[PDB]
C-alpha positions as protocol buffer text, in pm:
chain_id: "A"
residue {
  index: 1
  type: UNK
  ca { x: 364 y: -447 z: -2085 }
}
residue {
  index: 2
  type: UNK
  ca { x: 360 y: -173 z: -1797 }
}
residue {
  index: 3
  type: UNK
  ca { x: 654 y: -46 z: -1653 }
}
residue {
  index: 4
  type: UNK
  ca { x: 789 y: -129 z: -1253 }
}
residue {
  index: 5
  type: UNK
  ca { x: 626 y: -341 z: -1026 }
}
residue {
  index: 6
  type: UNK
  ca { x: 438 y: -304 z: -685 }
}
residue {
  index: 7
  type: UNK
  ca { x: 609 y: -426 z: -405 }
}
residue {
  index: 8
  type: UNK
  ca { x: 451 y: -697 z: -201 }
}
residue {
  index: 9
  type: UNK
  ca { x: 185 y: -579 z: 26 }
}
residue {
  index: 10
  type: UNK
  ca { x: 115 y: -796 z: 391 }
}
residue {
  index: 11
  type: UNK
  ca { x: -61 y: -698 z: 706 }
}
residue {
  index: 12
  type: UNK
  ca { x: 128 y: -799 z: 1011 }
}
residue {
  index: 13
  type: UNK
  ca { x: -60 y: -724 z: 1375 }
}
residue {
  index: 14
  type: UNK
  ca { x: 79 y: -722 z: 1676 }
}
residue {
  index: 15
  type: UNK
  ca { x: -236 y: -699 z: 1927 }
}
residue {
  index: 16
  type: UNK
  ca { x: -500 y: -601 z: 1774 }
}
residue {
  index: 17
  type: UNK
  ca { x: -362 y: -340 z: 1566 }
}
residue {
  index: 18
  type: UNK
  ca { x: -242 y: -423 z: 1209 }
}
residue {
  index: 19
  type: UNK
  ca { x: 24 y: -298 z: 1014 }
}
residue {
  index: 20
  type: UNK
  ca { x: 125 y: -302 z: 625 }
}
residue {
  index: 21
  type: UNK
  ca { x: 453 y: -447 z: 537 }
}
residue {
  index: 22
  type: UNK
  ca { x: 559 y: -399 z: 167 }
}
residue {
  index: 23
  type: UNK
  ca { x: 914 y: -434 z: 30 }
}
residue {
  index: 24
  type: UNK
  ca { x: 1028 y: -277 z: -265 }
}
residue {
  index: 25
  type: UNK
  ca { x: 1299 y: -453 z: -528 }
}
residue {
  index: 26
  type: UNK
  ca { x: 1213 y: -367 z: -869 }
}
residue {
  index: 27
  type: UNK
  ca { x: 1388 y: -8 z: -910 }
}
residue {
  index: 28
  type: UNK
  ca { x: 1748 y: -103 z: -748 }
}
residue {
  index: 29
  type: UNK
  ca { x: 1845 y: 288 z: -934 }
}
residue {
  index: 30
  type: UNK
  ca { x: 1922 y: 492 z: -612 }
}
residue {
  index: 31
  type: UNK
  ca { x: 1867 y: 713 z: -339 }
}
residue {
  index: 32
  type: UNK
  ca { x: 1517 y: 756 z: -509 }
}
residue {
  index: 33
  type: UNK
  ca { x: 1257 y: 892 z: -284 }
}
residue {
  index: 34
  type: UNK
  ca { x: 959 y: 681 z: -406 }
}
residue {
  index: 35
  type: UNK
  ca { x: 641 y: 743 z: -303 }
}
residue {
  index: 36
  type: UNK
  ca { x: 374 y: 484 z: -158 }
}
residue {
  index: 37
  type: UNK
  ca { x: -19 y: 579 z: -223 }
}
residue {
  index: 38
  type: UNK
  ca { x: -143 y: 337 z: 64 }
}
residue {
  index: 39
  type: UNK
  ca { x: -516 y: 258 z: 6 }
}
residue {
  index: 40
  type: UNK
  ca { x: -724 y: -6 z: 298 }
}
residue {
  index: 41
  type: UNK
  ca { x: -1050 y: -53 z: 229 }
}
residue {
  index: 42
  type: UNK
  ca { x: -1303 y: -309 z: 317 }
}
residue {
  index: 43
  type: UNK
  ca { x: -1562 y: -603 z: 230 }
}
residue {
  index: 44
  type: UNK
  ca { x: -1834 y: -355 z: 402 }
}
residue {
  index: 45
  type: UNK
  ca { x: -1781 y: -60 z: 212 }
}
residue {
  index: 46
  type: UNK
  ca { x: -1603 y: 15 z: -122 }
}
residue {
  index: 47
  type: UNK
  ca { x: -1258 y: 141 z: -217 }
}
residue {
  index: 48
  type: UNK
  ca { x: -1394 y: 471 z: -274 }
}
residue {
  index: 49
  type: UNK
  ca { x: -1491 y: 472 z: 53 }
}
residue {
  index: 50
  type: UNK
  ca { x: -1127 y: 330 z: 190 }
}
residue {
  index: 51
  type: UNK
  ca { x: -900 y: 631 z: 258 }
}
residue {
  index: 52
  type: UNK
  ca { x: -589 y: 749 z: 32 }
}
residue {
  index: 53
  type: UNK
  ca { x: -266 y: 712 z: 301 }
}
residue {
  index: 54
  type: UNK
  ca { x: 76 y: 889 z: 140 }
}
residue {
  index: 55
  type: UNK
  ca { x: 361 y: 682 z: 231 }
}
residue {
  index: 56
  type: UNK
  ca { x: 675 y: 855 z: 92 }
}
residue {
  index: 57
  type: UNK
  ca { x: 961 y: 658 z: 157 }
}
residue {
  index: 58
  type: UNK
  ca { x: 783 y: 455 z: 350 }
}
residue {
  index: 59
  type: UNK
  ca { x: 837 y: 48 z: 410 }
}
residue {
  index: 60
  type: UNK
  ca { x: 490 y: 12 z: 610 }
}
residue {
  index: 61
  type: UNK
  ca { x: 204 y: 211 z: 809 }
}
residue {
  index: 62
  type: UNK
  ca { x: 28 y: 160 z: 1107 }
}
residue {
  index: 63
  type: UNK
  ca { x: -350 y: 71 z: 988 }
}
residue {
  index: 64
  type: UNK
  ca { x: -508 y: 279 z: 1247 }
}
residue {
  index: 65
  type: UNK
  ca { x: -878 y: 318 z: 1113 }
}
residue {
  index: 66
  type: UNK
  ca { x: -1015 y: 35 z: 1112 }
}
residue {
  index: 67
  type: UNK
  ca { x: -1296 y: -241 z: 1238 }
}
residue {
  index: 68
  type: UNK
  ca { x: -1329 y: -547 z: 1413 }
}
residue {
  index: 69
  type: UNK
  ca { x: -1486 y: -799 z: 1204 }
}
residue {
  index: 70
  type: UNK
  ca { x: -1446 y: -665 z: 859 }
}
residue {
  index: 71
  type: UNK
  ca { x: -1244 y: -787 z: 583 }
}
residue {
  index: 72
  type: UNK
  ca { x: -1008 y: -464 z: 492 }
}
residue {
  index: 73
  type: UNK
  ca { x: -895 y: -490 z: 156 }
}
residue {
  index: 74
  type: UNK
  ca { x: -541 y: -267 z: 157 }
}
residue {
  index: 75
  type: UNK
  ca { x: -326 y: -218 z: -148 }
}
residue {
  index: 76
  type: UNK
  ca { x: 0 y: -12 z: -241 }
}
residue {
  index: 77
  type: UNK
  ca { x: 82 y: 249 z: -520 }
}
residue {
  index: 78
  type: UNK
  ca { x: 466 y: 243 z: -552 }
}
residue {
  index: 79
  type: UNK
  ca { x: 533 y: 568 z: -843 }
}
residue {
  index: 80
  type: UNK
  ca { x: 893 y: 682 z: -867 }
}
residue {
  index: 81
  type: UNK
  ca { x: 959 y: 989 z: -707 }
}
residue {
  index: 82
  type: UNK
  ca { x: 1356 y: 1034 z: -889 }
}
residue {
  index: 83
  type: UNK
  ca { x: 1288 y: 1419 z: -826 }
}
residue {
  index: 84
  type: UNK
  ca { x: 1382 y: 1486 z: -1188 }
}
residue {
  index: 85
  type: UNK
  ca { x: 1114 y: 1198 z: -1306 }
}
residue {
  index: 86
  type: UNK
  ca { x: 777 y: 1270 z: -1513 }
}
residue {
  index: 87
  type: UNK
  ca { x: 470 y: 1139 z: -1305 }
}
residue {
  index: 88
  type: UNK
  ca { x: 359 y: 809 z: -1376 }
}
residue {
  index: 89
  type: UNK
  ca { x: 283 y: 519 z: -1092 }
}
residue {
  index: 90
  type: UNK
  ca { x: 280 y: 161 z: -1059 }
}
residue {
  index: 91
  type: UNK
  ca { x: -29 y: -84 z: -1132 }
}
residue {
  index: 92
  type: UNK
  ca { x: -165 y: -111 z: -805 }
}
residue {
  index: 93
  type: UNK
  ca { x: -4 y: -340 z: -584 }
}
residue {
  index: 94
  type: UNK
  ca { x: -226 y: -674 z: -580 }
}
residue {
  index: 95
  type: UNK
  ca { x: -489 y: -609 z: -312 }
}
residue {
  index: 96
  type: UNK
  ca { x: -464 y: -768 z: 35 }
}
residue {
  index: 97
  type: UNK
  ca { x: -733 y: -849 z: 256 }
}
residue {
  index: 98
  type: UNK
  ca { x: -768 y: -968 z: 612 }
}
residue {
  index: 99
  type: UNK
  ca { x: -948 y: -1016 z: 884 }
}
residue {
  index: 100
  type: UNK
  ca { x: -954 y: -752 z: 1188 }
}
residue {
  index: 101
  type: UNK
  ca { x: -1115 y: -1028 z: 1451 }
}
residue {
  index: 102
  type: UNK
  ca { x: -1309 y: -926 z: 1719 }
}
């Protein structure tokens, strides 16, 4: 069994332009800092390709690279940044993927 838990990641737009929404509840320790490794790729190209977003202390970004008509397949990497901690990370938050319209 791993350890933590990543949040759950959801793409909300508000014209045009989409934005992730993730909401952590699985530390509940403290003021911990917490670092998100935001990752948005997409059914054209491969997550290699996507780009590596650090969201520290973040609750959400603003998905500003992206493409009409393409599925973008975004995910969240929620480690736990206690200052004093090692360096280990989460699992990957379960990968999301939606449609950018046209």
């Amino acid at each position: 069994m791993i350890q933590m838990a990543p949040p759950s990641l959801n793409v909300t737009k508000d014209g045009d332009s989409y934005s992730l929404r993730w909401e952590t509840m699985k530390m509940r320790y403290e003021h911990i800092d917490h670092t998100f490794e935001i990752q948005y790729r997409k059914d054209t190209a491969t997550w290699k390709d996507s780009k590596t977003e650090t969201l520290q202390n973040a609750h959400s970004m603003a998905l500003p690279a992206l493409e009409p008509s393409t599925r973008y397949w975004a995910r969240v990497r929620v480690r736990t940044s206690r200052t004093g901690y090692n360096g280990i990370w989460s699992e990957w938050s379960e990968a999301r993927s939606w449609d950018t319209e046209s």
